[PDB]
Short mmCIF file of C-alpha atoms and ligand atoms in Angstrom, two decimals:
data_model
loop_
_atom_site.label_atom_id
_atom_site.label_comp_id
_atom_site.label_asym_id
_atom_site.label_seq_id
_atom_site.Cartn_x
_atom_site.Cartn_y
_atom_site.Cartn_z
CA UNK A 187 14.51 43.27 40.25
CA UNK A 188 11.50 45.37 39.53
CA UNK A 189 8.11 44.46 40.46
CA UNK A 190 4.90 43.53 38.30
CA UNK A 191 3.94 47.69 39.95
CA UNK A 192 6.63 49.30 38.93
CA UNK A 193 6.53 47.63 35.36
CA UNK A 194 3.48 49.80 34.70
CA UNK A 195 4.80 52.44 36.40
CA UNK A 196 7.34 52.52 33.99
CA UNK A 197 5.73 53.46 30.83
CA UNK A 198 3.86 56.60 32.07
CA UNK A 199 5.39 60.01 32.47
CA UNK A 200 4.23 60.58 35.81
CA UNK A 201 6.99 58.22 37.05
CA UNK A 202 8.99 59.13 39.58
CA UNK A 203 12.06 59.14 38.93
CA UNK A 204 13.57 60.35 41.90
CA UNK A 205 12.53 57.32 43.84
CA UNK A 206 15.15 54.90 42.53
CA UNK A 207 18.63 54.53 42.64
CA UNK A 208 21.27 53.90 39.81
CA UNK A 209 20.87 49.48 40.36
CA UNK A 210 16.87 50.04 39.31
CA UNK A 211 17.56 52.92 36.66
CA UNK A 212 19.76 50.45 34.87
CA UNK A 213 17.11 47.68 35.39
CA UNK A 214 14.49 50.26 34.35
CA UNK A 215 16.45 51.04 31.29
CA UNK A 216 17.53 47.22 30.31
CA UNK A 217 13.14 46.40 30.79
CA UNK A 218 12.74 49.09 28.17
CA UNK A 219 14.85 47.32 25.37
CA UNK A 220 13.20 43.76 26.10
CA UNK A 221 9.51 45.65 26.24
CA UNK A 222 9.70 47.15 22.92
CA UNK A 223 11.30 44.06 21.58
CA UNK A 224 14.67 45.44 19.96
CA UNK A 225 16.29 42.79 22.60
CA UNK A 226 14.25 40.41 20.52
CA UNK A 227 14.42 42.03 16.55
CA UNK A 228 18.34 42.97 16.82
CA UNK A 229 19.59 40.05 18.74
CA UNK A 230 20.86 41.70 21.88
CA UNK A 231 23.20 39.35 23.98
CA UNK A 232 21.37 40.22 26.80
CA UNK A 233 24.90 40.38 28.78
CA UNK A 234 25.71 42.72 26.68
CA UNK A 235 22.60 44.90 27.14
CA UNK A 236 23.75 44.70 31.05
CA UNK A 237 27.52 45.70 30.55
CA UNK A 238 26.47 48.41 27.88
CA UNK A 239 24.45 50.35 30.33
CA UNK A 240 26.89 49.90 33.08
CA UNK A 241 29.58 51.26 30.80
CA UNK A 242 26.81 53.90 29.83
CA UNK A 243 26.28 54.86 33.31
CA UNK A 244 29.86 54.83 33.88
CA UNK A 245 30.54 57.49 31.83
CA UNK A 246 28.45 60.04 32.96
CA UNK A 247 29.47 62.75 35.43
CA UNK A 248 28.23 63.80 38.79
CA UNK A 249 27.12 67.53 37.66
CA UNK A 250 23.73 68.58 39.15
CA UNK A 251 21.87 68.62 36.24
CA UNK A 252 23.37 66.94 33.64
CA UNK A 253 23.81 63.05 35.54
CA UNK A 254 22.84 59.93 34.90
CA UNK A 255 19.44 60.43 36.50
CA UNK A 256 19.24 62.78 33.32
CA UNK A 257 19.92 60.47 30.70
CA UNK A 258 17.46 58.28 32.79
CA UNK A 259 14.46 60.81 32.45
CA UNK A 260 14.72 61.74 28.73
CA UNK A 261 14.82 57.73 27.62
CA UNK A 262 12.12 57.28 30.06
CA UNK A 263 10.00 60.39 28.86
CA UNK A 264 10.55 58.55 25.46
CA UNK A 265 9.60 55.10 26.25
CA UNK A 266 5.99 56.88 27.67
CA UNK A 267 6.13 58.85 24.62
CA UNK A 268 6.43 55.35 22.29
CA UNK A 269 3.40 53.80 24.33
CA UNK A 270 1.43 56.81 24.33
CA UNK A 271 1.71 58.06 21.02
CA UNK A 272 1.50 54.14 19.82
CA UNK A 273 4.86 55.07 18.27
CA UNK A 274 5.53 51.14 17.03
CA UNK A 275 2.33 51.69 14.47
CA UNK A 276 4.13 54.68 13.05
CA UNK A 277 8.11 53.69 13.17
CA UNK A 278 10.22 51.55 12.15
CA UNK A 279 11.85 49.45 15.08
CA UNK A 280 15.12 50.41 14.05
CA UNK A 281 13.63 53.97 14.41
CA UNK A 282 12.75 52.87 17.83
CA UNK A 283 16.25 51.53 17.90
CA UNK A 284 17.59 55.27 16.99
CA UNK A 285 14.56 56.68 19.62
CA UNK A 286 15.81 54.79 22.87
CA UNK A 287 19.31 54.76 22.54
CA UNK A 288 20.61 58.38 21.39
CA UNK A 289 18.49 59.49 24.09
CA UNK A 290 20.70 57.24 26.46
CA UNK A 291 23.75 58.33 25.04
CA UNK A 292 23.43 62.06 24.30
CA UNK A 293 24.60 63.88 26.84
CA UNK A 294 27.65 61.32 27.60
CA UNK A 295 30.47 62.95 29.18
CA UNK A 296 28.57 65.67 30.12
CA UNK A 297 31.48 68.40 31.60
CA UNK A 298 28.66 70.37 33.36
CA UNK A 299 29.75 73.40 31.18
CA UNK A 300 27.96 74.47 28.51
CA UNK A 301 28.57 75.05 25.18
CA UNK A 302 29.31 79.08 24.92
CA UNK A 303 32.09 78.26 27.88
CA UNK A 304 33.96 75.68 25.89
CA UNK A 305 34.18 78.09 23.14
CA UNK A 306 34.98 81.90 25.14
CA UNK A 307 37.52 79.36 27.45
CA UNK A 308 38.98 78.15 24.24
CA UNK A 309 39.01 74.32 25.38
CA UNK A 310 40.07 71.03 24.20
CA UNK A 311 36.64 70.24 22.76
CA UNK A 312 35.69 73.32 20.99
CA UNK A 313 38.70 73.42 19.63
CA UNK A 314 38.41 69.45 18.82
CA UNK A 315 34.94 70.23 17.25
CA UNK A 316 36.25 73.96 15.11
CA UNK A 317 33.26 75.76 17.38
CA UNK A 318 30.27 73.27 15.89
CA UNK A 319 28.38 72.07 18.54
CA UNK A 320 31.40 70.90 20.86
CA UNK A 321 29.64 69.41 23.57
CA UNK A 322 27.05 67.61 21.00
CA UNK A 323 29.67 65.74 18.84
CA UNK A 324 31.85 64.57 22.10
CA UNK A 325 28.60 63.13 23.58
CA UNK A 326 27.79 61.13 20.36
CA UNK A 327 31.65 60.11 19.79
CA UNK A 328 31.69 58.69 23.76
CA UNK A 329 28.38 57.46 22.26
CA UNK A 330 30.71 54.98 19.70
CA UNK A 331 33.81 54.80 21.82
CA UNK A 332 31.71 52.35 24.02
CA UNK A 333 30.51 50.54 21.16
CA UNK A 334 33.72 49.91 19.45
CA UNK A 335 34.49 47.77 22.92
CA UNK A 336 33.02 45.16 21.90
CA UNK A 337 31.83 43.41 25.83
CA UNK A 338 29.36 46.89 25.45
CA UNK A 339 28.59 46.68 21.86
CA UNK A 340 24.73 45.98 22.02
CA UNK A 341 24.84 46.15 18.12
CA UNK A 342 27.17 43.32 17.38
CA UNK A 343 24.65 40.77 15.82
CA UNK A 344 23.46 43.77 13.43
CA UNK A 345 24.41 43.86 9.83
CA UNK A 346 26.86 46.54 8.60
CA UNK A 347 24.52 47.80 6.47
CA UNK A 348 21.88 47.96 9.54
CA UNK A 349 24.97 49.31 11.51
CA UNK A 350 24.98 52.68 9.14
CA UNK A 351 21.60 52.98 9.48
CA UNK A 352 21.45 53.29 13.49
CA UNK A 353 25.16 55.12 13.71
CA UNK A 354 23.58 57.79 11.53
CA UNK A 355 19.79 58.15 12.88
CA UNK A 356 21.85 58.46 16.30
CA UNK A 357 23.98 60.76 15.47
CA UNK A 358 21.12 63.57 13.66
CA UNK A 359 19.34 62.88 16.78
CA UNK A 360 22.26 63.37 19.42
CA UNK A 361 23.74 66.26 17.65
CA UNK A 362 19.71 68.13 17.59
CA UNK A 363 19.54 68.06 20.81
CA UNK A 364 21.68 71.44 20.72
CA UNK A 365 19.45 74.09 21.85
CA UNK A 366 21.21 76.72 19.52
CA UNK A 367 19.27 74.94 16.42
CA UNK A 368 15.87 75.24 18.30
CA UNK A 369 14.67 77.51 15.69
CA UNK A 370 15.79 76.05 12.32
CA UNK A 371 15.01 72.67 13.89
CA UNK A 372 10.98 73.64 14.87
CA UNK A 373 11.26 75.87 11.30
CA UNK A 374 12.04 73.24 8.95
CA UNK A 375 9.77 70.65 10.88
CA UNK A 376 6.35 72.99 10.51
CA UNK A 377 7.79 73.06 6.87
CA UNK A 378 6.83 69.51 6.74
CA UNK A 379 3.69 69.90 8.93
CA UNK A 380 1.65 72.31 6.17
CA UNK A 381 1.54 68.53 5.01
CA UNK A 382 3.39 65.35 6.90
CA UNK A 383 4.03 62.26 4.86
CA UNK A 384 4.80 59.05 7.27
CA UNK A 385 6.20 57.29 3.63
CA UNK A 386 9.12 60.12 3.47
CA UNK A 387 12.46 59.88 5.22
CA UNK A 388 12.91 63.32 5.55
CA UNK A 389 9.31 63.89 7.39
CA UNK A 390 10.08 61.25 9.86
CA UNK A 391 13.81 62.19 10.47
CA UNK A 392 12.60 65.66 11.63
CA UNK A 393 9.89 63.98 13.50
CA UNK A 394 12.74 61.73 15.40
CA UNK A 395 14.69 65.16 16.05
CA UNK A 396 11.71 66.83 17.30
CA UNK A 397 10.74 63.73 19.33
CA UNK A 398 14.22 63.70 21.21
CA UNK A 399 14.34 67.28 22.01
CA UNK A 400 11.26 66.99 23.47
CA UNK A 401 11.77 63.83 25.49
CA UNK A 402 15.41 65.89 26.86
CA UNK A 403 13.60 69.08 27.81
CA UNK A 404 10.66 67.47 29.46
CA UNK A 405 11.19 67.62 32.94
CA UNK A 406 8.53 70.21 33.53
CA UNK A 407 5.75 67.92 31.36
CA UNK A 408 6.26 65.89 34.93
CA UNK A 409 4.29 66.08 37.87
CA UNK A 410 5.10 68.96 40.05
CA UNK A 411 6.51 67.09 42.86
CA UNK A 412 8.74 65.47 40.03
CA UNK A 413 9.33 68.30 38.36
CA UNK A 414 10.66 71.31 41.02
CA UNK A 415 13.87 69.65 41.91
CA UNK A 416 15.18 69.35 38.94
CA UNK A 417 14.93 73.13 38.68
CA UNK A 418 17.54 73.54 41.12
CA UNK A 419 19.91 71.35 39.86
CA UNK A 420 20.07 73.35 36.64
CA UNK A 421 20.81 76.55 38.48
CA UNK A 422 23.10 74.73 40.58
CA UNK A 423 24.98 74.04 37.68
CA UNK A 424 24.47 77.56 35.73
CA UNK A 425 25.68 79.29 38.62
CA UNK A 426 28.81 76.81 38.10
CA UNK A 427 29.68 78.13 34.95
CA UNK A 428 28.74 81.78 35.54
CA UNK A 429 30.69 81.54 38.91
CA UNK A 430 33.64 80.44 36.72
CA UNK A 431 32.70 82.24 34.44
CA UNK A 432 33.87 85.40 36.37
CA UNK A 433 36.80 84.30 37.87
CA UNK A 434 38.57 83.81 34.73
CA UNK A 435 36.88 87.47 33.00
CA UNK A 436 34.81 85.21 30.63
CA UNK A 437 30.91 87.04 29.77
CA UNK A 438 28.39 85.23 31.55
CA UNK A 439 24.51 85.02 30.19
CA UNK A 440 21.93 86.50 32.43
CA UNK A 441 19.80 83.68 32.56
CA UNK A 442 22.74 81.40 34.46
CA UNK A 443 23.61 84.64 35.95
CA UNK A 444 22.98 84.12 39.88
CA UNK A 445 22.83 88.16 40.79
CA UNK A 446 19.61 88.09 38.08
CA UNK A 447 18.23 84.41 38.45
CA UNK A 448 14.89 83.92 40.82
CA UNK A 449 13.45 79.85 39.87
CA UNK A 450 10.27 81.85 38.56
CA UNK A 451 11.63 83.71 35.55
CA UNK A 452 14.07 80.59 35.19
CA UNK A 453 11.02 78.40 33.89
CA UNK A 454 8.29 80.97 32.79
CA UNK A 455 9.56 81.91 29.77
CA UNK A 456 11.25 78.22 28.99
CA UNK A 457 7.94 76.96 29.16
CA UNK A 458 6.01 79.81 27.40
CA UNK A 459 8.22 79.94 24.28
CA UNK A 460 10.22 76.45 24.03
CA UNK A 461 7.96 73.64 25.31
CA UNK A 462 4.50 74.33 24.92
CA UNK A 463 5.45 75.79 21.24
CA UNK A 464 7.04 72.76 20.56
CA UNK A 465 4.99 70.28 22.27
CA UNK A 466 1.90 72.13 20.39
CA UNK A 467 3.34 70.75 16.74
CA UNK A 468 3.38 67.47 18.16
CA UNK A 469 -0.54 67.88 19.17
CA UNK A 470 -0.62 67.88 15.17
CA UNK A 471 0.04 64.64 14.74
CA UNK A 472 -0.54 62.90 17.88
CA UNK A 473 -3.80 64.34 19.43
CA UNK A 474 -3.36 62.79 22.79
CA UNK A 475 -0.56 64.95 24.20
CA UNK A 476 -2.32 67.53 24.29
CA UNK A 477 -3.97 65.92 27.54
CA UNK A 478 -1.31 64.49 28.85
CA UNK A 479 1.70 66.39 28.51
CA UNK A 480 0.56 70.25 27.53
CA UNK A 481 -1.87 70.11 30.79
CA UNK A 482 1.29 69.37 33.05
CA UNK A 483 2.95 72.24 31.09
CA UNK A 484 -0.04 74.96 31.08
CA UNK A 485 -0.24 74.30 34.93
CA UNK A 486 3.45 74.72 35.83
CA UNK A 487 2.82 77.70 33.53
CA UNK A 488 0.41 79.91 35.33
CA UNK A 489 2.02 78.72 38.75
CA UNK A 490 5.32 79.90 38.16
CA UNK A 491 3.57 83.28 36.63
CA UNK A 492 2.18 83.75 39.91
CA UNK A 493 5.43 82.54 41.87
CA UNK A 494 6.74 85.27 39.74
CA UNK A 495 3.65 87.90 40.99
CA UNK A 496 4.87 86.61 44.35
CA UNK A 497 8.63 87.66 44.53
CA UNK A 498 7.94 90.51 42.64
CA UNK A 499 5.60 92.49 45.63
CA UNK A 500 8.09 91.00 48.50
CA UNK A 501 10.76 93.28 46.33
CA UNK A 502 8.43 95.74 47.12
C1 06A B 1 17.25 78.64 32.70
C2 06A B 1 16.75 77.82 31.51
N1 06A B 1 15.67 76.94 31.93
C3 06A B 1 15.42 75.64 31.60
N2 06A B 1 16.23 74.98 30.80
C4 06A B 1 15.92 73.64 30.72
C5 06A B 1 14.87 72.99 31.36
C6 06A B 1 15.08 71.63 31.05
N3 06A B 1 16.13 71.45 30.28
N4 06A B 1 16.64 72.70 30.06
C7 06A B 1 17.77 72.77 29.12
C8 06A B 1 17.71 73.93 28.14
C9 06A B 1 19.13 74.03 27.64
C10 06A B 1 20.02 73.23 28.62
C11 06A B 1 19.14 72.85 29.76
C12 06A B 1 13.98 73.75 32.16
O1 06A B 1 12.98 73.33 32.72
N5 06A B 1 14.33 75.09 32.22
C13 06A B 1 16.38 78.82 30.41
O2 06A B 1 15.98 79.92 30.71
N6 06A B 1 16.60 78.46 29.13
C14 06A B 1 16.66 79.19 27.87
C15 06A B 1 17.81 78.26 27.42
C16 06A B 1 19.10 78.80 26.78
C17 06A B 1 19.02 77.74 25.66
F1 06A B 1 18.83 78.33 24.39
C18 06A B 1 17.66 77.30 26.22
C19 06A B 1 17.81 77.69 28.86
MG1 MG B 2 22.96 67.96 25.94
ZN1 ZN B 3 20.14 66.69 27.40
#
């Protein structure tokens, strides 16, 4: 039970979402689909809405980064971004259908291992997956496996054809969230920004992939105070995989690397050369981020530049 406060709360990306506990995530995630009416335009059993996310929470992991507090953050970062951008003039609410839920379900399953250890270790899923995106496909399959029980299947009063429609937006927009198509992701979408076209279903899928990579890697676009934890569960769970990485002879990548990590050069260049970049195309075509999500990111910016000027004399 969340209160009239907390209801406003919940649309703006300031929220804290360190405050709550998995009972008023789930709430905070089931007011979502009634507030942007897909509850109401899909027919949602709204029992089934409640069992869904349980089964969705379920079936993430307790890692440090990748949790369920996680999947919380990037659906919340875009239901602000649907408000804020006025996202319902723009898409289609089966669009907003493909928004909200892929960023619930896209990191399902999460092993807390990346996606270069599943292939050097040789695992079950990268050899499932034949080395493409292991980690991205398994995500979006638990994504299904839950729907295909039908007591979770928030879909079930949708039309096959409208079925086809949402499996596939979900699936482009769970398997972008790979951070090894960045480039040709951001590439192909400024391709369509020399001139975007709202009519054309290539324009707007790009803009949906674009939209949920941002909402996944937004946790610095947060207030500070919301923001700096979340810093150290990531290297909490790098330092996972690069300690195991070493105990078995595996390589290990410098940035997850704990003998070269400081929390400084950990977010600098993330920020300087993944975030604001992309969060600058969106400026494009929705003018008020710049305000309200690049000003959280320039400040982090020049802070953990100086953090950086900091550790670098006490070396000295
Ligand atoms: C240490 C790290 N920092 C970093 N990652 C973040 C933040 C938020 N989500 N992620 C995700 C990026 C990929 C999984 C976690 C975040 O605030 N900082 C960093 O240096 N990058 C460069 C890359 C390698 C891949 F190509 C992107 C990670
Ligand atoms: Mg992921
Ligand atoms: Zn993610």
């Amino acid at each position: 039970l969340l209160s009239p406060e907390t209801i406003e709360a919940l649309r703006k990306p300031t929220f804290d979402v360190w405050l709550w506990e998995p009972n008023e995530m789930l709430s905070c995630l089931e007011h979502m689909y009634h507030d942007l009416g897909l509850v109401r335009d899909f027919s949602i059993n709204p029992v089934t809405l409640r069992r869904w996310l349980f089964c969705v929470h379920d079936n993430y992991r307790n890692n440090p980064f990748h949790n369920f507090r996680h999947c919380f953050c990037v659906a919340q970062m875009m239901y602000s971004m649907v408000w804020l951008c006025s996202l319902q003039e723009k898409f289609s609410q089966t669009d907003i259908l493909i928004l909200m839920t892929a960023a619930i379900c896209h990191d399902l399953d999460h092993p807390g291992y990346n996606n270069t250890y599943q292939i050097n270790a040789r695992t079950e899923l990268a050899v499932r997956y034949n080395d493409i995106s292991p980690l991205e496909n398994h995500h979006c399959a638990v994504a299904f496996q839950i729907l295909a029980e039908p007591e979770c299947n928030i879909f079930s009063n949708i039309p096959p054809d409208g079925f086809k429609q949402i499996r596939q937006g979900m699936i482009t927009l769970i398997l972008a969230t790979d951070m090894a198509r960045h480039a040709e992701i951001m590439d192909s979408f400024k391709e369509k920004m020399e001139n975007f076209d709202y009519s054309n279903e290539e324009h707007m899928t790009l803009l949906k992939m674009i939209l949920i990579k941002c909402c996944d890697i937004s946790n610095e676009v947060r207030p500070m105070e919301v923001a700096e934890p979340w810093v150290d569960c990531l290297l909490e769970e790098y330092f996972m995989q690069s300690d195991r990485e070493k105990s078995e002879g595996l390589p290990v990548a410098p940035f997850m690397d704990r003998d070269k990590v400081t929390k400084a050069t950990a977010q600098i260049g993330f920020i300087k050369f993944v975030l604001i970049p992309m969060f600058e195309t969106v400026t494009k075509l929705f003018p008020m981020v710049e305000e309200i999500m690049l000003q959280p990111l320039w400040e982090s910016r020049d802070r953990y530049e100086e953090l950086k000027r900091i550790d670098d004399a006490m070396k000295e």
